[PDB]
Design a protein around this nucleic acid. Structure first.
Length: 251
RNA sequence: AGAACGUCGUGAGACAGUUCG
């Protein structure tokens, strides 16, 4: 009943897992006064003393960790990265400051794509939401141009061959016309690169606009400005946890 | 082949990884 040291320290807000591995590898991290090595595990208990460069780090048990969730209306022009080699804007730039924890992005969006991005302090929740084993729904509003008929919708639902293998939309619903364009709401239960655009392209349809409008049981909040965040309340956080079989928080 | 982040994993490697660039 233990965890890799870098998992614990990342949860505590002291860097990413792999960043922390570098610090461990450099002999800078100790447990109970003894230098830790890469791969070491610890069991968080009240008296455990983990230090980085001699400085004590306050840590928490995994199951008792802070589980906050934000809904963010990700705007075009921001990257889903914590460290862009080129220094371009990121989705983390305006999120509220946290100590003793950090925001984890639940998946990524393309820079030029708008829509809902969840963040959470709880990396178990994050992975359970992202990993396709639990088949969490991602819903997009898609504006397309091209011939579409029920046969095409059938093909997209039953599986088409993409460059990186078979893929299918889980649901597809016509949501309205506009000009020489139609809107559809579609869902996927995985998240391959540009998958929504590439599915439509595979059946000869081009995508002019693409907005992520729901992740799991959390819709893009009504009235949330583009580029704005809002924090989910306890009930909503618990609903999201329950979706991926995590127990509810009481706080 | 340029990166990020989670999750497993005494470090060798992994995921039904994530709409990265």
């Amino acid at each position: 009943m233990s965890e890799k040291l870098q998992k614990v320290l990342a949860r505590a807000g002291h860097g990413s897992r792999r960043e922390i591995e570098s610090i461990i590898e450099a002999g800078r991290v100790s447990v109970d006064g003894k230098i830790a090595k890469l791969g070491d595990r610890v069991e968080v208990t009240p008296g455990l003393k983990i230090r980085i460069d001699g400085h004590l780090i306050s840590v928490r048990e995994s199951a008792e960790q802070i589980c906050r969730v934000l809904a963010y209306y990700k705007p075009e022009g921001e990257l889903c990265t914590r460290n862009d080699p080129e220094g371009r804007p990121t989705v983390f730039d305006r999120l509220p400051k946290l100590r003793g924890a950090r925001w984890i992005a639940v998946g990524r969006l393309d820079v030029n794509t708008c829509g809902l991005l969840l963040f959470t302090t709880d990396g178990e929740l994050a992975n359970r939401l992202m990993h396709p084993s639990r088949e969490v729904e991602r819903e997009y509003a898609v504006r397309v141009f091209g011939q579409v008929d029920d046969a095409k919708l059938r093909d997209l639902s039953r599986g088409v061959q993409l460059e990186d293998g078979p893929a299918a939309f889980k649901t597809i619903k016509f949501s309205g016309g506009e000009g020489i364009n139609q809107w559809y709401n579609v869902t996927l239960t995985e998240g391959r690169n540009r998958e929504v655009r590439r599915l439509w392209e595979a059946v000869g349809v081009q995508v002019s606009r693409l907005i992520r409008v729901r992740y799991g049981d959390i819709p893009l909040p009504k009235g949330l400005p583009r580029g704005g965040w809002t924090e989910l309340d306890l009930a909503q956080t618990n609903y999201l946890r329950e979706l991926v079989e995590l127990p509810p928080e009481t706080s």
